[PDB]
Structure formats: structure tokens, C-alpha cells
Amino acid sequence: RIPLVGKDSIESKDIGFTLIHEHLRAFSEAVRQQWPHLYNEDEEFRNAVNEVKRAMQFGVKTIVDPTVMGLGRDTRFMEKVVKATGINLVAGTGIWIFIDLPFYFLNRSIDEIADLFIHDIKEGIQGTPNKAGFVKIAADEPGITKDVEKVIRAAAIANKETKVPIITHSNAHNNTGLEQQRILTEEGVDPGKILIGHLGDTDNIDYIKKIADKGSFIGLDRYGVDLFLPVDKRNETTLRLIKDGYSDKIMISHDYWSITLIFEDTIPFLKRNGVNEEVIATIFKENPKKFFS
Amino acid sequence: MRIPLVGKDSIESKDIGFTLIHEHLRAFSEAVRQQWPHLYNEDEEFRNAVNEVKRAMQFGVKTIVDPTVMGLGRDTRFMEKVVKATGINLVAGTGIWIFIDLPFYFLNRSIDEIADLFIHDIKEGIQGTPNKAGFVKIAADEPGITKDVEKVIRAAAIANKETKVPIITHSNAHNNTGLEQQRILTEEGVDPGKILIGHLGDTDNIDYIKKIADKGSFIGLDRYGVDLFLPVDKRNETTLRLIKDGYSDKIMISHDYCPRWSITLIFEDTIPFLKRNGVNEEVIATIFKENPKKFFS
Ligand SMILES: [Co+2]
Ligand SMILES: [Co+2]
Ligand SMILES: [Fe+2]
Ligand SMILES: [Fe+2]
């Protein structure tokens, strides 16, 4: 029921321990095509493989990679790492923009954009048989611009036609997440199929709860990126939200400084502060299972 | 020994010949095409590329300047794959086509870092091919001159000083963006006659077109066939008005071709029209030969 990169599908029950938001590799499609002398596919590949290998050491079974248009999605690269590690990797479709769309989308309808997403879900991605397993959309400081709203509505339509869930990028300080959730549910999207991301960058604990209360997963997913909020402020927001019994809605990731910083810092901090392996299992196993259920 | 070419060796800026200064063999969004290749068809775009190039050589075009850059799908492998089938003098370029923001890769990065990336295309080559870049292409439009748009403008000027190359721009004829690019590049001390300000033929406000021409810069009447911005006869009215008002030395004409829109509509219409309205053969040589020669000298 969940498509995978270079494997057969899996039942949502078998997803296992999951990191819900990690980037194997991410870049601007335009910058790379026009100046490859700034990149190297040799170092990029090895670091992907070894980081994943470590992640499999610590017990990570499944990785969800929300690299889409605007972030350099390459399914050929993804089927490489799957070959070299055997990891369960979920790829998605969608559009990552903050203001306007590429000039190609001038005079194109929302149903024209959803077709692209529905194409990646039903037929495959970039020619390969790898199919999308979720849609990814984004909003930030500019808030909900009109092209950003076109993208949100194109995701709601793909969700209703394929029932794959939606991951969002948002800005924690300007209400974009709540607006994403408001527009998506209005269009019929089940709240439980929505992950509002990048809420770790805030401490307005009542804003986070307002999103969780409406039935969507909340993203505490920017560890290691210590330029937004220090980790030991993130770990207290997480713990606070866990002490209030919100672990059924909490989702934690790195947004990738390494892809094991949670096993080194986050999880050990939490287990020292009370949370049993039930809470840890709710966040990294059961919540991903409902999200793809 | 001056103007690099795609699939060929360098020529002097006075062997340039009959130039179409602004044409696109192909244009697309790198981000859209990399993600949804089922939308495109390289083979059809190869046949149409070659068809229209050689048919422009039938009418005597010797050189086509192509300002397809970052944001417009520049691909020198496709370019020299068309040169091999036509023998055209193709001038590739470097630069950044944006209207609001730069890609996130450029976040916190510096004006000189961007300029270093144009100079890599000019001095070392483009996309790891031995094809170099003969000019810098920058852009502005309806969003106005914004912060990152202004950083690419100045990044271009810095490539002008070091490399010498001229600078083709894309503006919006209806909001003084073209003038502001000139106001910014020259206030940065670039040779005004090394700036071609583009798409001025989209308006019939002659006074605005002349103010840019008077300040020393080439004006671009370069979207022939695109009737959504201005119909053809209304463009022939403006081009003629500008010729008979003295400005033939700072006029450049092209199609910007990526109704009756092709890459030879000026030979099928505009040039017969101008001849029968008092334009002799030496002024059309000024427009398609002399003005290019100077731009690249
Ligand atoms: Co993100
Ligand atoms: Co243009
Ligand atoms: Fe991300
Ligand atoms: Fe153009």
C-alpha cells in the first residue's frame, strides 16, 4: 500500500521504525544544471549510503524523503542508495515554493498541477517505476501567496484521488501551518493525513496544540539545524508536549549535523526525563503507521 | 579571437555578420523538466530547432545570439547538436533569469560569488563543455526591481569589468524596469553602449524608448510575432518612427522565438515594410550588422 523506491510495495503495518523527514540529497535544479562544477555525485553518494547505514544500525527501518521540485528530486539517485543499503525509502511528489511557480505554470489550472502529482503517484516518477507515496507542499515567510495556494489545492485533489498523505513545510512564526491545515481540510482532506512541519522552531505551545487538536500530526523536525532554535529548547517543547499526552500526534526528525543526532541527543534526553519506550514507539513507529494507514 | 561560438572556434567582433541578436533554440524550466520529463520531447525540439535555424540561413542569417540562461533551460549539448546540423554561428551566454527571488542556494551568498559563476562560464566554459559564454544575461519584469534582482544586475556589471562582455537584459516595457537596469549598471560604471535593454518593442511609448536610447544604450525591439504584447504593424510603426527620428544606430531587432510567429517573420514582413517606407539598405545593415559589431567590440 506504500510504494517504495526500488522494491515492491509494503503494508503500512510493516513500515517499522521510521524517520519521516530526511533528505538524502537536496539542491536547486537550475543551479545544478547550469553549474555542475559546484557538486560531486561521488562524495554525495557515499555520504548518503553511510549515513543510511548508521541509521540502520540504530534501528531505522524506513526513511521518508520529501525532496521534490525545487529541491532536486532524483529517483535514479534514490534507487542507487536503496540498492546499496536495502533501506525502505518512500519518495513523494509535490512542489516546494515560497512565492511564485516556474513560468511554465503561468495560465495552468489547479487540476493541471494535480495531474502531475497524480502522474507521479499512479504511473511513476521521472520514467522509473518508483511511485510517489505522499505529496509535499511548502509555505514560509511570504505566507500563503496565490501560487502557494494553487499548490495546496493541487495536493488536496491528489490526496482525494490516491489517498496518499500530505507533508508540509511551514514557518513556525507566521501561522502558515494553521492556514495549510485549514485550506486542506476545507477541501476534504482528512486531518489525520496531514503533517504540519517545522513546528520545532517555535515555543508558542498553544499554536502547536491548536494544530494537533484539529487532528493533524505536528512536526518537531529540525534537529541539528541549530540556527533556528537551540536543541535544548526543542527538547523541552517536545517533552512538554509529551507530558500533556500529545505523543499520538508528535513526529520528530532532523531535516537533513547528522541523521543520527536524535539517537545521540534527542531520544537519550527524553528517556532521562521519564518517557518510556512506549512513548518513543508511539512517535517513530505507530504515528508513521497511522499516517500511511 | 573575441566572440566565442558553440561547436566552433572564436571569431572577431567584425566578422559577426547578419545577426539575430535575441532568439532561443529552446527554453524551459530546469526544475519542471527535471521532475516531469513526460511533458517534453527532445526529438521534436531538435527538428524544429534545426528547421528554423537553416531557414533563417536561407534568408542570410550568419549568427544567432541565444540568451537562454539559468531559469530558461540552457543546455550547450543541445546547442552544439544543432550547430552540427546547420553550421550556424551560435553565441551562448551566462546569467540569471529571475523576477523575484534567487534560488535558495544563493541564500547569504555574495554578489561576487554570483559574478564568479558568470566568469567561470566566460573564462573556462559552460557545463563542463569547452563552449564559452559571449555575454551576460539578466532580467527584470512586473514584480519590479527587487533585492535579489538587483544583486544579479550588479553581479553582471562585475562580469563586465573583468571579462569585457556586453550585457543583454530582459525588462517590462510598462514599468521603467528597463531604465532602472540602465540606471543601476551605469551608476556601477559600465559602458552604456555595452548594455542592450530588452523588450522595449512591447510598448508604443516612444518617449520612454528614446530616453534609454539617448543615455547611450541599445534598445531592443525584439519580440516580433508576439501580438499579446503589441501587434506587428504597431511595432513597425514604432520601429520606423525611431529610424526616421535618428535612432537607427541604437536599434536592434529580433523575434525572441523559443499567430504568425517564427524566426523569419522579419524577412517576410518587417524588412519589406521598412524598405518601401524610405529605409535604404545601409540602415538595415546598421541594425543587423553594425549595431551587433559595436555591442561586442
Ligand atoms: Co523543509
Ligand atoms: Co526575455
Ligand atoms: Fe526538508
Ligand atoms: Fe528571451
Residue numbers in the entry:
A (entry chain A): 2 to 257, 278 to 314
B (entry chain B): 1 to 258, 276 to 314
What did the article's authors report about this structure?
In the two other mutants, αsD6 and αsB5, loop 8 could not be modeled due to the lack of electronic density, which was likely to be due to the high level of motion of this enzyme region. Analysis of the normalized thermal motion B-factor supports this hypothesis. Both residues are located relatively close to the bi-metallic active site, yet do not interact directly with the metals (V27-Fe: 6.7 Å, Y97-Co: 4.3 Å). Because W263 substitutions were previously shown to be key for increasing SsoPox’s phosphotriesterase activity, we used saturation mutagenesis to introduce W263 mutations to the background of αsB5. For example, with ethyl-paraoxon as a substrate, W263M and αsB5 produce a catalytic efficiency improvement of 14 and 67-fold, respectively, while the combination αsB5-W263M increases activity only 11-fold. The destabilizing effect of these mutations can also be observed on the overall enzyme stability, with αsB5, W263M, αsB5-W263M exhibiting Tm values of 70.4 °C, 85.3 °C and 69.1 °C, respectively, as compared to 106 °C for the wt enzyme.
Phosphotriesterase-like Lactonases (PLLs) are appealing candidates, being natural lactonases endowed with promiscuous phosphotriesterase activity. SsoPox exhibits high acyl-homoserine lactones and oxo-lactones hydrolysis abilities, and promiscuous, low phosphotriesterase activity. SsoPox is a very appealing candidate for the bioremediation of phosphotriesters because of its unique thermal stability, and its ability to resist aging, solvent and protease treatments.
